[PDB]
């Protein structure tokens, strides 16, 4: 059931794709590979086709390519991008060189939405509800997104949202424990990002737009207060602890004064997300049950993920072993239904 491929050079890269994909037109992109928008004649939708650049160049890359393919094959949720298709022109493992990924194609991200209209409080409720619902799913597979920000959130005309572009340039949405490498970090770095996104949707202002790491830490500590002893004990680096203790102590601000005029249930949820100690931050599942989302919350329609086996991260393999495992994964891909 190998399709018919056709090859065509555009922007000095050869694209060799099944004929179901028509009207390929470049849109970038960067270090991981080039992407074209295309029309998928099987499904009737527009899609993004990504050609991986040099997927098997070193051990680090071959493993990275395998990691991304494993992750994308696994993610099956309304609010998380999934893999529509993956293919190679290769007919055998011998001859295997290129990998192409197909996904849905984002019209607008969240910045475009904010740019073309004023969001109501109800829009912010639905948008954030959908992020947390996606996140509940991701986190239940022991996956951490690590790079949530407005431009990694696709949003359509119906205000339906999907989370894109997992890690793995804007630092403003990043939890401080990872920004300054304080510790072995957990899933709630993503909740910190949601708090930053939601605060900015409510006020129109970026919450922590620091010009460098220190400046941003100072903006953050000003709002949430300097760390107490309990958090200080959990910072692994002595230099990090030492730098932190050199700061003048600062109390937590009253969030009602910071977010004047916002729905008080919104502000309350922000205080649950923007907590410096990541062990005290609200989880995605808990956030979905918050009175802020009473119009959208449905505990029977908030699924978790199948178990996701990441024991491959520990394997020590040759380039050709990563590449052959990647090939297996291309061969076993089953597309979404109808």
């Amino acid at each position: 059931e190998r399709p018919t491929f056709y090859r065509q050079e555009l922007n000095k890269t050869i694209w060799e794709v099944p004929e179901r994909y028509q009207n390929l037109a470049p849109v970038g992109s960067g270090a991981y590979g080039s992407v074209c928008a295309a029309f998928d004649t099987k499904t009737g939708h527009r899609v993004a086709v990504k050609k991986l650049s040099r997927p098997f160049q070193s051990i680090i890359h071959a493993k990275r390519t395998y990691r991304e393919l494993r992750l994308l094959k696994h993610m099956k949720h309304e609010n998380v991008i999934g893999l529509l298709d993956v293919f190679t022109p290769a007919r055998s493992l011998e001859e295997f060189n290129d990998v192409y990924l197909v996904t849905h194609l984002m019209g607008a991200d969240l910045n475009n939405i904010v740019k073309c209209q004023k969001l109501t409080d109800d829009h912010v409720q639905f948008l954030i509800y959908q992020i947390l619902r996606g996140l509940k799913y991701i986190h239940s597979a022991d996956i951490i997104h690590r790079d949530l920000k407005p431009s990694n959130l696709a949003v359509n005309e119906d205000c339906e949202l999907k989370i894109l572009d997992f890690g793995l340039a804007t630092r403003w949405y990043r939890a401080p424990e990872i920004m300054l490498n304080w510790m072995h970090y957990n899933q709630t770095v993503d909740i910190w990002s949601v708090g930053c996104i939601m605060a900015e949707l409510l006020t129109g202002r970026t919450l922590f737009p620091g010009t460098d790491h220190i400046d941003q830490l100072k903006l953050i500590l000003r709002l949430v207060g300097t760390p107490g002893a309990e958090l200080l004990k959990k910072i692994s680096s002595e230099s990090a602890r030492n730098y932190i203790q050199s700061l003048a102590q600062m109390p937590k601000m009253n969030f009602a004064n910071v977010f004047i005029g916002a729905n008080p249930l919104a502000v309350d949820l922000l205080e649950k997300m923007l907590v410096l100690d990541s062990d005290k931050r609200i989880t995605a599942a808990q956030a979905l049950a918050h009175a802020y989302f009473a119009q959208y919350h449905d505990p029977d329609d908030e699924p978790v993920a199948d178990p996701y086996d990441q024991s491959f991260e520990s394997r020590d393999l040759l380039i050709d072993e990563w590449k052959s495992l990647t090939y297996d994964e291309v061969i076993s891909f089953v597309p979404p239904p109808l």
């Binding site: 073309c116 209209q117 109800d122 829009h123 949003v155 359509n156 119906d158």
Partner: peptide, 11 residues
């Protein structure tokens, strides 16, 4: 939450 514009003239 209803009927959004996706695209608009500015920047």
């Amino acid at each position: 939450a209803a009927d959004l514009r996706i695209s608009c003239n500015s920047k």
